[PDB]
Write a protein that binds this ligand. Structure first.
Ligand SMILES: O=C(O)c1cccc(O)n1
Length: 115
């Protein structure tokens, strides 16, 4: 609170560390469903069902242009990709399995890098 500050975690390297984690997800072989925005004019249901679409290229653009205030807002957009994937796909499908795999892959890198 006012004039009572908790000790400050060092955040100076967060931009480059997030950028690196994103690079690794972009090159994972199961990233293909998540590389580009879903086409809302061509894909049934998506625009109406998925209220906040997110994809790796949109995250890369936001990261490169100063649109993430901090670590946590970046992790929220990455998790959003995989939450959208669960909402729109059966677990028992190739895309549904790709989402589960990419999420596991992300959270491990997250813990290792920061926790
Ligand atoms: O064909 C599908 O099941 C599909 C298409 C677009 C996005 C998405 O999540 N799934």
């Amino acid at each position: 609170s006012m004039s009572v500050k908790k000790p400050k975690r060092d955040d100076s390297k967060d931009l480059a560390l997030c950028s690196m984690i994103l690079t690794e997800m972009e090159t994972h072989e199961d990233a293909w469903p998540f590389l580009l925005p879903v086409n809302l004019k061509l894909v049934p249901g998506y625009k109406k069902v998925i209220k906040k679409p997110m994809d790796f290229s949109t995250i890369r653009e936001k990261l490169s242009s100063g649109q993430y205030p901090n670590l946590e807002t970046f992790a929220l957009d990455v998790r959003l990709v995989f939450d959208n994937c669960e909402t729109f796909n059966e677990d028992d499908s190739d895309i549904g399995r790709a989402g589960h795999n990419m999420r596991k892959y992300f959270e491990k890198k997250w813990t290792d890098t920061f926790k």
